[PDB]
Design a binder for this molecule. Sequence first.
Ligand code: L3T
Ligand code: MG
Lengths: 233, 250, 237, 241, 233, 242, 212, 235
Amino acid sequence: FRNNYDGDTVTFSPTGRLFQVEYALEAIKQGSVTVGLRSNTHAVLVALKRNADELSSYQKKIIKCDEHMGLSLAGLAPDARVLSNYLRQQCNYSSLVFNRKLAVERAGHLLCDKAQKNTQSYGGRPYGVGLLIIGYDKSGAHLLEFQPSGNVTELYGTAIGARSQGAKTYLERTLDTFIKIDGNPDELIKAGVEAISQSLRDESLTVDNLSIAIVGKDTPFTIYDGEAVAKYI
Amino acid sequence: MTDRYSFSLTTFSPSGKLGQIDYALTAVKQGVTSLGIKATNGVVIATEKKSSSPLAMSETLSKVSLLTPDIGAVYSGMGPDYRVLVDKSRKVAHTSYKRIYGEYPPTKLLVSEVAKIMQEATQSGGVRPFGVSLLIAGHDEFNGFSLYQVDPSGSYFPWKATAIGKGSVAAKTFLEKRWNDELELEDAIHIALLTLKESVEGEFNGDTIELAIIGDENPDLLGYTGIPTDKGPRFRKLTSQEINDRLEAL
Amino acid sequence: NSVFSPDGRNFQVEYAVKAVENGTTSIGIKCNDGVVFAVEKLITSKLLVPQKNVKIQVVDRHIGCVYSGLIPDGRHLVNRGREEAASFKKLYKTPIPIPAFADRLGQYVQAHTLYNSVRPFGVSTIFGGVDKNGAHLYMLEPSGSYWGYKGAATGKGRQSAKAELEKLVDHHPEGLSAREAVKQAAKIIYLAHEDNKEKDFELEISWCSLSETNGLHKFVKGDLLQEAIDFAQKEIN
Amino acid sequence: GYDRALSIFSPDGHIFQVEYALEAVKRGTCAVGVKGKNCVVLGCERRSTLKLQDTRITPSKVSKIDSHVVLSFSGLNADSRILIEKARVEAQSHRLTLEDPVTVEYLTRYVAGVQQRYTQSGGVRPFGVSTLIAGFDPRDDEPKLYQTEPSGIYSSWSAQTIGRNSKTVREFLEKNYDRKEPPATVEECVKLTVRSLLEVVQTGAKNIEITVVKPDSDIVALSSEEINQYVTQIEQEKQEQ
Amino acid sequence: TQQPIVTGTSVISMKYDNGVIIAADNLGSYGSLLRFNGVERLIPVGDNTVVGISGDISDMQHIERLLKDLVTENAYDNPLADAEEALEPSYIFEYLATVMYQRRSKMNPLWNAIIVAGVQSNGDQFLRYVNLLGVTYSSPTLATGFGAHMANPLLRKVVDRESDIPKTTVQVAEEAIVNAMRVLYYRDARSSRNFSLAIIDKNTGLTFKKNLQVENMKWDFAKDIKGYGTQKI
Amino acid sequence: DRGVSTFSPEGRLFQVEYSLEAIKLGSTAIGIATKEGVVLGVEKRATSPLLESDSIEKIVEIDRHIGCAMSGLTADARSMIEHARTAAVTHNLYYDEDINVESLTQSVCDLALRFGEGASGEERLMSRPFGVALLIAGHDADDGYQLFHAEPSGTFYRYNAKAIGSGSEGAQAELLNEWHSSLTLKEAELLVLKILKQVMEEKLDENNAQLSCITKQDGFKIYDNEKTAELIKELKEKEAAE
Amino acid sequence: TTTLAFRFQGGIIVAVDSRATAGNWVASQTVKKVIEINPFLLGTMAGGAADCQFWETWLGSQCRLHELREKERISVAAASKILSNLVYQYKGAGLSMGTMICGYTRKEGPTIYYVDSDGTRLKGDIFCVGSGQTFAYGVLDSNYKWDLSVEDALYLGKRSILAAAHRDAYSGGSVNLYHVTEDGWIYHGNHDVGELFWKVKEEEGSFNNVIG
Amino acid sequence: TIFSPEGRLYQVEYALESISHAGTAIGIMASDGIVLAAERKVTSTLLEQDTSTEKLYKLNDKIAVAVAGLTADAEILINTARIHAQNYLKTYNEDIPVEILVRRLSDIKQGYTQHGGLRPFGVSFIYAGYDDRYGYQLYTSNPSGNYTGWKAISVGANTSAAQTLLQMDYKDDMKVDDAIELALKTLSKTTDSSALTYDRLEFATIRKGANDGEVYQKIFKPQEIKDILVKTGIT
Ligand SMILES: Cc1ccccc1CNC(=O)[C@H](Cc1ccncc1)NC(=O)[C@H](CC(=O)NCC(C)(C)C)NC(=O)C(=O)c1c[nH]c2ccccc12
Ligand SMILES: [Mg+2]
């Protein structure tokens, strides 16, 4: 059943499963936790950055895609670079040709379609990264979860990576409170920073640990690291 | 869309055999007997029409084919492989010869091109060798009459007389015993009929046997008159009735 | 994929069907002048935004598609249907007839069962609309097989869905209005959710009707949707 | 057409195909190079198996790449022709564009690069060849000797050897090559090179071939007679104690 | 390399207080032959935009097909296609301007002069021109062909600068357009008596008027004109 | 053997993991970033005493402000260096300025991704990952002195100090204890030389180990043998007095 | 444009004007027509400004690439040949350039190469290039000697460009002066023709065609 | 194409193994000519001896080959060799030196060894030729793409046995006629048949052109072989 069937993305198991795609999903669970959530006016990414060593830099989880859009990553980081470059181009193309800011929903569809081709081509592997995409478009704030299977879902909040199940349950409980946090960026970041804490066995999240991103009604997508996150720890 | 077998499917084994070529040669063995006999003034190629159904019209399936006005072919092995090889042989006679020198290729050179086409199915990526052996008989001004066998490996050999397919060993024996260098075409046709009766199970008549000759020029088959230097094809398929005439005094 | 078994089967396609059977249930119902499409959307978590993970897709302006199995595969197929419909419209000026469109998808799905370097699609697709000569509904399997239908169902709750569909065909042989068909689709989707009752679900309906939408594909929303839900809620108890 | 990967990583971090390419070099006839104060000598063994050869026409092991640079190898003979041809093209190209002949380092880096390329390309296998590249930079009297291997690694050597039983002759040259005192002249440099082969050849008749490279494009092969006299003197002089 | 064959003359347009007006006659000329008489050169896109096209009619028919494909394509996977994510005039314009400029850069132009008129979702008037060179400009009044020489001067007597636009009513603007169409019919040898006119108002929406005619023409003074200088009878 | 870019059941790329094993078999390379420069040091490791050690190039100049040290399958590193140099010189051509160290590193890591065939989405002109790791050191105006570790996985990390190659397990723990923000360049030099001496299998001298640094003022320099020798009397005399 | 370079006893003198023209329009009077490729290599510019600026800046990149690759400064011969071969690829496309590559290396000594967009490449001791070339030639050739002191050679360079600046409508602005040695270019200043002409007239007793 | 752990090329070795079952071909070089002789693979009474050439081929007017292996593979290579000789003649207005032609063919075989995943050609060649640089020459090439020059050589079956015999009786001062005798004796001693009759042989010479100063390739007609077989006392 798992025997001769996980050789490539081009073979179904007798159960109708694609093991290469399921194995790609396992690189996400190996990745460091990141949280995303939104209200009507803002959307926030919170990520726990991971070092290799005490002598090293913590590696970034947050990438900007346009002035109104960006994403956090969990899994194979170089795959996130490939996908965010594509997303940067799609955003760019939309501005240049149509003078139009790319809907976050269309960005979702584009990523899904790109992932899909890699779940059906021989000699190519599926992507091995999970992504949380936030944006403020012509219909407000949005959050998306992307899985390398190509499934993208729109959510009020979510978390991916190791021990992320904690943060998810928290947000599931907090729902009716944070959906309303409108016109107060600092309160929403606080609710995000608290969500990521339910996913800690590690430690206490330091100035280097912690990565926060925000976008909204009158705020371009902006990334906070180092001393600029201190006021949230 | 796109090939994943861009490598040779015929490879050498530890013992030196080319597996796929041997297996193709076994496909020839299971095939209906065909034969060729070379005379002083002609060549005869003959074979059985093993029909698949009595509801099938066996005149709609020729095993004996004109390749040029002076060259015909027959086979033993896989029919559909033969059919496509005939198309390519016809085409290559034009593209590699007639469109260059304004005349049809001599037998050996055309056989050479067919052999080449078969060789490539033995070395190229993602293909199996052709599952047939051909007998090719023809005439040309400077070489006279000739007869060639072509094998699945692309090998070809000239023959005075030979047989391929099912009972080829018994038939070659029968031919070695009967052949000589003074045979007229009618003698060769006679021997071809006798040799073929040993092979045939069922009815043995002009409707179940298929026979062609490379003989003299048939000006009545040319289709036009007025050009003296054009005399008509030497390839001639004998009719059912013409075959039955030779089976009465058999 | 290109491999025939000793008895002439294609195990890979049979395995692709198992992915479809594993999927959410979706249906189509052909009415007197159009077609209705309905699908079960599993609510994985409260965090999923209501009304915002649209499954039903439009092709051109007059065709809807719904599917079960690997959602991305279905999207891949719909992208191809859109390219295929644009190319027909480009050359022939008229929008693509539904049977013409069916074969386009058909041939494309069948191609993915010819080559060892490709896998079959892991979806079944229910689709259709209105053209020059009436309504048509089609269902398309991973093998590329497709036929016209009076009603169609695929996915996990397919068996009960088919049984409710069969009953309608029996009690309404005289051509089932567009407005009735919508109501009934809501009902049938409710009655296939019995299997997956451990998790909650959201209902999506769309329709293409001559008298109701002018032969264009529209989403059922607002009061029409609520009325169909209430009918289904009442008839389930 | 065909670009399937054949050279890939093992669980323990080796590239099997490159390692197996090294095995091919291991069975190739022995080749050695030592550098004097004002020359570089290239020595190669020829096999005993078949002694009915025509020596006039058989491809020899030492090849001119340009008029001031030579190449010898161990491993697949056929493989070596591809490297030698490409090196020669590169040499002419260099004169054409830079208006100067290649340095021995440049040429080596080029050959090594080609070798490396065949270890990371789909559809191809690595070269079953190691090379010794020897000669003099334009307008320079300082001798150069480099070695390349299937991986594409290259380095310079005072003296080096490759091929079958090279382990032995390396052991020999390690004992007998002194860096402060190199061989002072051509005559004594050849003698050391023959001595190292005589450890492995065991009659060396026309079984040893020698090539001497001097500064300013002065490259000469040695005949049997010249080699004979070296072999003769070596076993005669070294006997009594 | 190419040359217009069947052509359609001026497109004229202006801004008023609450929207835009655009008009074009119904003729397709074949050199000096007035060949076709029922030609619509105003193209509604959605219900907030009218594209007015002059120049080559075959290229005009190509641009129609593009605009319809754009509406179809925008509707795909877009639940807000008739609300917040409907096509805006500026999107439609930028798109055409991209096409036009790309085509001239490939030395294969769409032989047209185009005016995009409409109202943005924030109520703002949109009026912009693009042509076969990819030249683009905006003005309170825009006209192509003869219209640029004769319509603009009359229209500018009403809207001479930005601040004249709160001050200009629907009635005054339409009056000025209609008069300018009359002047064009007097002096343009490739113009027609029949024209279409479209009003895009932020309150009313789209009003598309077909089968309009030039009326109140002055011809009586012709009778007094004798000869070309000296002739008396 | 089935595929070249296949995931394991754990979610790891088989071939990438194995390439990391090849790096472990390499010569040791050590880099230390200070506020006065970055020191790169390598073990030369001659396979035989007849090898001319100064032909062993394991520290290379990329641009005046960027140098790098390699460990693993060092032949693989040629085209990485060629790409790096081209990126830097090209950047200067397009922009009349120096390329940022981080940007140069990212470029080298983009190149490392392109193994496989040409994956459905774009194209890959390489059959296996590189079997070599790089320490990339330099200076720029925005971030000062920097040290990066470039892996064949396409990931890269900044480090205050880093060891790669066979001695890297032992050398890293040693660097954990010894590194502090205040080190001077002279202190950094000495620490690299100390840590190499520990992990090396001969006795360390100016022929089996090599030193380099990068300062804002003088740029990237490989120290000749005389200068390193005079740092090795110095380290001996320092440890002898302790 | 007028540019020149000559070899003498004490190295190479390189001198250029600084006028940019587009038709009869004076586009600039203060333009840089020498590119400092490296501390031992200079390139001059005549013809199409963009063509020159772009390709000699590109040349510097290629020269730098050579240094990293070969661990040695590129020769004058090789640097000039890169530009020569590039320009030859583009032959007939309408590139317009007249160029001198001037430098020092141990192996070559001081060296001048003329390279143009026709593909011509010549090694020589004296070149004048540009619309003003003949004017510079007139003064340079009539006062040239191998044994000129550095001081005199710099003056002859300066004076030749002034000559061309005076007679050629398409030359002028200022003189930029360079001396290339074994050690190796040294800049010898910008000299505005507005002041230099009157200064030279007074001190030299030349320019007697000029009134006042 | 791949290497074994032993550092050998499987497919090449198996191709070589195939060749050792093909009819022996012998080449002998003398001071005034070259001999090529080859044993035809177990034939039949009905084979057309007259219009058959399975082992010996003309490459140009000065160069010929003896084949051991698959004939169809060999015709492929022979054809490109013929083209190569004509390209050289067109370029330089001189006949191609033998080594140049041999190296080219050998490079083609080598290619299949190193890239492209196609099987190697199952062919070994003996080349016999003359040119104004090296006079008479004999080379051999096999599926690996390696080539060597010889005074006398064999390929195909029983090379080991045939090589020992040639080593013994060969002498540098031979005339072609003595070389004709040597090749036939060697084939006679090493056949797996009863007798070495004419119908099982192909034979050719490259001589100094009867009487001229020019070079002539004589491909022996079956009748000629019968005579030259009596002369040498094998009948
Ligand atoms: C070699 C050099 C290097 C640096 C500085 C100066 C020089 C001396 N050379 C010139 O002055 C040449 C003279 C020349 C003219 C026509 N042919 C061949 C040679 N001028 C140009 O190349 C000018 C330069 C220019 O105007 N630059 C603008 C700037 C930098 C001075 C502000 N461009 C132009 O005239 C120009 O671009 C054009 C003028 N009309 C055009 C229409 C279409 C496309 C381009 C042009
Ligand atoms: Mg079903």
